[PDB]
Amino acid sequence: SSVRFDSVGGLSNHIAALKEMVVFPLLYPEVFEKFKIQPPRGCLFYGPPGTGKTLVARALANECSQGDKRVAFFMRKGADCLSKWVGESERQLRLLFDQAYQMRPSIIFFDQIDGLAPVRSSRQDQIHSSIVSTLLALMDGLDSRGEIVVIGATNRLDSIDPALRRPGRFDREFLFSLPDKEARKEILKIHTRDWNPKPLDTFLEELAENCVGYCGADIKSICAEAALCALRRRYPQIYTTSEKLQLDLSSINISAKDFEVAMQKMIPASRAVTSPGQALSTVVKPLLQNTVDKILEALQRVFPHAYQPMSFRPRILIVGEPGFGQGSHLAPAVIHALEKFTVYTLDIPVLFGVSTTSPEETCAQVIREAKRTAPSIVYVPHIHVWWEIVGPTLKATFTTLLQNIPSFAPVLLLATSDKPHSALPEEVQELFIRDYGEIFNVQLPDKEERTKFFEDLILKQAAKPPHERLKNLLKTVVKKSQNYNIFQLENLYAVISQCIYRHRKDHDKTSLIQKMEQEVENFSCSR
């Protein structure tokens, strides 16, 4: 009840263009008559859940209610205008509009419009058509309602009748996406303003990036869970009492461990489906960063969005012999590093994994959105298998549905295959022009990163408080592992760490060093 255009983060264009429907005419009424303007007086909010849409309504109400100029405010729920008696289920609307009009100026806030104004059709009750009829005949009929601002909000945009969406009834539509890296530090700055041990800004600076997929509410919830877990760490015996105790509020400071434990304990909201973009694990990290960075360089060569930068039909392909893990370790890292651009999965488990609908419908739909949210990414894994599991109908549908895409739009098509481009079937080899720079060949890592992979486990992790032969073992294992694929690599790492985990309680070494040896020779990969 005290939020005034300060608790919202990153919403600059929308706020700036929002104050110009309700404040400017009252503040500067000497300009609009100069040209007979009557500026637009309605707009619509919509975006994926948990992005903070009702807060801006709070903001306008709270800010404009108190000040030099006083404007009313009304609020309505989704289906609050329906009652039992037939002739008055609509009469309430007329009474409301009159009521607001006689106290003009004012604002009418419609919340959750989607359950109110469906698409008109004859496969339902006639009553919903009655309400939509009188409603759309009331904003702009024959009487020019005057100074009213109507505001609506919903999650599923397309399920609103195509009649309402034309200027005069609902004017503008606004995108409310997930926050980026910038907005995330902004919001965390906002929610930690009133803290005596003020956390260092460079600390929250690294705190920002690991919070991918987070949106508003998740950030707020984490800010509470951290403090709670700190208390949990501080006076743990509080769960074993049926009576009030005495607590000292001077030793429950907040530390990085609490942040980490809360972070690992909780999960982001976008929970319902899995996002095909993930950060590469710390375990494999010192092995593939060079590869990832090289791929990003090539992508920058072809797709310069990594005066306006301009492109023409951006495409690329990641292929390699099986066991290089190019389809389960490499690509999702590339997407995750390229955040700030929405990603749209399209593969076997999403197509056949959704029933009660046709594959072709969703295949058209996803490209529809990706176009509507340019620039964007379309992702399709395992093409050499994918092209064999679909009927001719879908082949035709997909292969014709992308030519109509405007040529200079920024849409990238990214796919991974395993069989080399020579063995791929025709009609797809025409979709990649590798003379252009549309094919990337992956190769084995060399010795340096190989050694870096094992050295941490085999030197420091091998010597802990709860020794020159180890150099020999390390060099031997490096020597023997120069022609393994990835899978054998992490299998070897797991088997090595398993021995340490087993020899945990033995306080004297030179008991497990032998075991390490036998594991070195007795464990052989198959190749």
Ligand X SMILES: Nc1ncnc2c1ncn2[C@@H]1O[C@H](COP(=O)(O)OP(=O)(O)OP(=O)(O)O)[C@@H](O)[C@H]1O
* Residue list for the binding site for ATP: 47-54
Q: Considering the complex, what minimum distance in angstroms separates the CB of residue 465 from its own copies?
A: 14
Q: Considering the complex, what minimum distance in angstroms separates the CB of residue 52 from ligand X?
A: 2
Instruction: Tell me: does residue 175 bind ligand X (CB under 6 A).
Output: no
Cβ 153 vs Cβ 113: under 8 Å:
yes
Binding annotation? 47-54
Within 13 Å, how many C-alpha atoms sit on residue 61's CB side?
14
Question: Which lies closer to ligand X via its Cβ, residue 189 or residue 467?
Answer: 189
Site string for ligand X, 116-155 (x = CB under 6 A): --------------------x---x--------------x
Structure tokens at 91: 């009469």
Count helices and strands (H / E) in the chain: 20, 10
Among 217, 283, 374, 459, binds ligand X (CB under 6 A): 217
Treating both helix axes as pointing N-terminal to C-terminal, what angle do 181-191 and 217-234 enclose, rounded to 10 degrees? 50
- Residue 8 contact partner, candidates its own copies, ligand X, none, CB within 5 to 8 A by sort of partner: ligand X
Question: Which lies closer to ligand X via its Cβ, residue 269 or residue 385?
Answer: 269
- The conformation of residue 411, written as its DSSP 8-state character, comes to E
3-state secondary structure of 441: strand
Q: Considering the complex, what minimum distance in angstroms separates the CB of residue 87 from its own copies?
A: 4
- Residue 7 contact partner, candidates ligand X, its own copies, none, CB within 5 to 8 A by sort of partner: ligand X
- Give every CB contact of residue 454 below 8 A, 6+ residues apart in sequence: 474, 477, 478, 493, 496
Which residue, 347, 317, 328, 349, is CA-closest to 284? Answer: 328
- Please report, as a single letter, which amino acid is at residue 206: E
Helix or strand (DSSP H, E) at 317: strand 315-319
Site string for ligand X, 49-68 (x = CB under 6 A): xxxxxxx-------------
414, β-bridge pairs: 316, 379
In terms of Cβ atoms closer than 10 Å to its own Cβ (0-12, 13-18, 19+), residue 16 is exposed
Q: Considering the complex, what minimum distance in angstroms separates the CB of residue 172 from its own copies?
A: 9
- The conformation of residue 31, written as its DSSP 8-state character, comes to H
Question: Which lies closer to ligand X via its Cβ, residue 142 or residue 310?
Answer: 142
Question: Which lies closer to its own copies via its Cβ, residue 44 or residue 338?
Answer: 44
Applying the rule CB under 6 A, the residues between 177 and 206 that interact with ligand X are 187, 190
Contact region for ligand X (CB under 6 A) — 16-24, 215-223, 404-412, 449-457? 215-223
Among 31, 163, 228, 396, binds ligand X (CB under 6 A): 163
- Residue 82 contact partner, candidates its own copies, ligand X, none, CB within 5 to 8 A by sort of partner: its own copies
Instruction: Tell me: does residue 42 bind ligand X (CB under 6 A).
Output: no
Cβ 188 vs Cβ 220: under 8 Å:
no
Give the count of residues interacting with ligand X (CB under 6 A): 21
Question: Which lies closer to its own copies via its Cβ, residue 124 or residue 476?
Answer: 124
- Tell me how long the chain is: 527
Angle CA 111–112–113, to nearest 5: 95
Structure tokens at 215: 């949106």
Footprint of ligand X on this chain (CB under 6 A)? Answer: 7-10, 49-55, 136, 140, 155, 163, 168, 187, 190, 216-217, 220
